[PDB]
């Protein structure tokens with residue numbers, strides 16, 4: 001499957017000055033880690049696709065993201081940055097790679113993990129897309145925003161395996177995990 005995962009504030013914010021608009025949420029991180037890492041097929045791995053700025057925002061000691069195949073998008077880089085598994089020059093190319101026999105027999109889920117520019121392009125993807133949205137239920141000052149989630153085509157799933165849907169809360173900040181699907 002092809003999947004996008006993001007955390008968004010109530011004002012649809014996703015970034016401020018190259019960082020997250022809110023303080024670190026422990027269970028949001030844990031959820032992200034588990035969902036992107038966990039394959040539904042024994043013997044396969046998941047693949048994460050991210051923009052260049054998001055790659056370099058990961059502390060070097062934690063690159064590549066453990067247990068996942070890490071693919072970075074960049075129009076300018078000539079070889080993969082140290083530690084990355086693949087470098088693609090477009091989202092089209094990255095998705096085409098995942099369809100090659102030697103990735104298809106290796107990869108289960110493909111996850112788009114940001115940043116803003118990649119989400120924008122991923123939100124224009126035709127076909128089957130699932131959006132795993134962590135709703136942070138507060139406004140935060142933001143300078144970059146997640147694209148509109150068009151409810152004409154995305155349906156909020158009432159339940160999803162492995163996803164706690166109840167409202168959560170850390171140091172007074174409420175949040176909840178949602179899953180949307182489109183098939184167009």
Ligand SMILES: NC(=O)C1=CN([C@@H]2O[C@H](COP(=O)(O)OP(=O)(O)OC[C@H]3O[C@@H](n4cnc5c(N)ncnc54)[C@H](OP(=O)(O)O)[C@@H]3O)[C@@H](O)[C@H]2O)C=CC1
Pocket residue numbers: 005006007008013014015016017018019020050051052053054055073074075076077088089090091113114115116117118119121144
């Ligand atoms: N709330 C959340 O869940 C998340 C939020 N974010 C936020 O996003 C913001 C950063 O977003 P942004 O600046 O867009 O950074 P990105 O991580 O999307 O990196 C942008 C760079 O990636 C490359 N790139 C992106 N899309 C493509 C494409 N389709 N084809 C080829 N190259 C591509 C380009 O590299 P080049 O210049 O080399 O061509 C571009 O300059 C930050 O505020 C950050 O906190 C990030 C992740 C998760």
